[PDB]
């Protein structure tokens, strides 16, 4: 439950990874919040 869980975010795929990494910083912080 530590390496396998880390492999989910470590996997992704370049653009889906970056848009994901950028979405993580702005998670519910764009739609209506901050």
Coordinates of N, CA and C in Angstrom, one line a residue:
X1 N 0.8 -1.2 0.0 CA 0.0 0.0 0.0 C 0.9 1.3 0.0
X2 N 2.2 1.2 -0.3 CA 3.1 2.4 -0.3 C 3.7 2.6 -1.7
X3 N 4.4 1.5 -2.2 CA 5.0 1.5 -3.6 C 3.9 1.5 -4.7
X4 N 3.0 0.5 -4.5 CA 1.9 0.3 -5.5 C 1.1 1.6 -5.6
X5 N 0.7 2.2 -4.5 CA -0.1 3.5 -4.5 C 0.8 4.6 -5.2
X6 N 2.1 4.7 -4.9 CA 3.0 5.7 -5.5 C 3.1 5.5 -7.0
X7 N 3.1 4.2 -7.5 CA 3.1 3.9 -8.9 C 2.0 4.5 -9.7
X8 N 0.8 4.7 -9.1 CA -0.3 5.3 -9.8 C 0.0 6.8 -10.3
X9 N 0.5 7.6 -9.4 CA 0.9 9.0 -9.8 C 2.3 8.9 -10.6
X10 N 3.2 8.0 -10.3 CA 4.5 7.9 -11.0 C 4.2 7.3 -12.4
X11 N 3.1 6.7 -12.7 CA 2.8 6.2 -14.1 C 2.2 7.3 -15.0
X12 N 0.9 7.5 -15.1 CA 0.3 8.6 -15.9 C 0.9 8.6 -17.3
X13 N 1.0 9.7 -18.1 CA 1.6 9.6 -19.5 C 1.9 11.0 -20.1
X14 N 3.0 11.6 -19.6 CA 3.5 12.9 -20.1 C 2.4 14.1 -20.1
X15 N 1.5 14.2 -21.0 CA 0.5 15.3 -21.1 C -0.6 15.0 -20.0
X16 N -1.1 13.8 -19.9 CA -2.1 13.5 -18.9 C -1.4 13.6 -17.5
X17 N -0.1 13.4 -17.5 CA 0.7 13.6 -16.2 C 0.8 15.1 -15.8
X18 N 1.2 15.9 -16.7 CA 1.4 17.4 -16.5 C 0.0 18.0 -16.2
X19 N -0.9 17.8 -17.0 CA -2.3 18.4 -16.7 C -2.8 17.9 -15.4
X20 N -2.3 16.7 -15.0 CA -2.7 16.1 -13.7 C -1.9 16.8 -12.6
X21 N -0.6 17.0 -12.8 CA 0.3 17.7 -11.8 C -0.2 19.1 -11.6
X22 N -0.6 19.8 -12.7 CA -1.1 21.2 -12.6 C -2.5 21.1 -11.9
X23 N -3.3 20.1 -12.2 CA -4.7 20.0 -11.6 C -4.5 19.7 -10.1
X24 N -3.5 19.0 -9.7 CA -3.3 18.7 -8.2 C -3.0 20.0 -7.5
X25 N -2.3 21.0 -8.0 CA -2.0 22.3 -7.3 C -3.3 23.1 -7.4
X26 N -4.1 23.1 -8.5 CA -5.3 23.9 -8.6 C -6.6 22.9 -8.3
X27 N -6.4 21.9 -7.5 CA -7.6 21.0 -7.2 C -8.7 21.8 -6.6
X28 N -9.9 21.8 -7.2 CA -11.1 22.6 -6.7 C -10.6 24.1 -6.4
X29 N -9.7 24.6 -7.2 CA -9.1 26.0 -7.0 C -9.1 26.6 -8.4
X30 N -10.3 26.7 -9.0 CA -10.4 27.3 -10.4 C -11.9 27.3 -10.8
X31 N -12.6 26.2 -10.6 CA -14.0 26.0 -10.9 C -14.9 27.1 -10.2
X32 N -14.5 27.3 -8.9 CA -15.2 28.4 -8.0 C -14.7 28.2 -6.6
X33 N -13.6 28.9 -6.3 CA -12.9 28.8 -4.9 C -11.8 29.8 -4.8
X34 N -10.7 29.6 -5.5 CA -9.5 30.5 -5.5 C -8.6 30.3 -6.7

